[PDB]
From Swiss-Prot:
This is Thioredoxin domain-containing protein 5. Protein disulfide isomerase of the endoplasmic reticulum lumen involved in the formation of disulfide bonds in proteins. Can reduce insulin disulfide bonds. It comes from Homo sapiens. Residues 3-110 form the Thioredoxin domain. It is found in: Endoplasmic reticulum lumen. Belongs to the protein disulfide isomerase family. Disulfide bonds join C30-C33.
Amino acid sequence: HMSKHLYTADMFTHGIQSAAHFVMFFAPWCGHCQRLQPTWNDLGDKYNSMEDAKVYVAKVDCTAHSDVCSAQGVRGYPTLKLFKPGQEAVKYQGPRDFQTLENWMLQTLNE
């Protein structure tokens, strides 16, 4: 369930410079991260396949890429960041249900 929408370090570095990304930094031992996996998969399934996609939904396993999580100043798990090419990243804080996540992502995209 956590295998879906996983990015490599290289995919992350280039992806966040090519298009908007809502990225989940997580750990397999993170209980909140586990419960969030199915919602994040739905978000990815809906948006990552869209034609002419303006946003992409991805994951970075911190236990696989500690160097990436360190560089992103990750504090606590999961950490939800929206990256926009050129602009500065925004850490999401708030309820983690599908409707709220989607609405915040959409509002934050056009700012």
